[PDB]
Design a protein around this ligand. Sequence first.
Ligand SMILES: C[C@@H](O)C(=O)/N=C\c1ccccn1
Ligand SMILES: [Zn+2]
Ligand SMILES: [Zn+2]
Ligand SMILES: [Zn+2]
Ligand SMILES: [Zn+2]
Lengths: 72, 69
Amino acid sequence: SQQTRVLQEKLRKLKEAMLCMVCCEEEINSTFCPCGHTVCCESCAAQLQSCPVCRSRVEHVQHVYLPTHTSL
Amino acid sequence: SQQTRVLQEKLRKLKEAMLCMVCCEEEINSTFCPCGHTVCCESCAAQLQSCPVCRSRVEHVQHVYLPTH
Ligand SMILES: C[C@@H](O)C(=O)/N=C\c1ccccn1
Ligand SMILES: [Zn+2]
Ligand SMILES: [Zn+2]
Ligand SMILES: [Zn+2]
Ligand SMILES: [Zn+2]
């Protein structure tokens, strides 16, 4: 039905929100400290000197283990 | 259809996985440092000495801003 298409869109947007905002290919699993923005995979986070959301300097990157994480 | 029911179930399980493991009522927004387990809301994380997942000592709690919030 049309409702199947609406639910597919909600699921797609929720899954896209869990993907790295820089590469769009890997799951988010890293936090920029101290600002706390959690928007990148570990490979993109290692290459950024400032946060891509708020431009605060990245003092260090904290790996995060989230219950939503998935793998092959 | 049955497909609508399958998608509703996937959405519900994904949303439940974003809720605090201690109170089950608020969204997860805090990380235990240095282990990195991100399983609690701020109020539940504030009072724990050890991580509820791995038992590592909690040196501090980092607030996290997630795009799914
Ligand atoms: C565009 C995206 O794939 C990407 O940026 N990849 C690596 C990188 C390089 C510089 C900064 C952050 N990430
Ligand atoms: Zn990335
Ligand atoms: Zn930031
Ligand atoms: Zn809680
Ligand atoms: Zn832990």
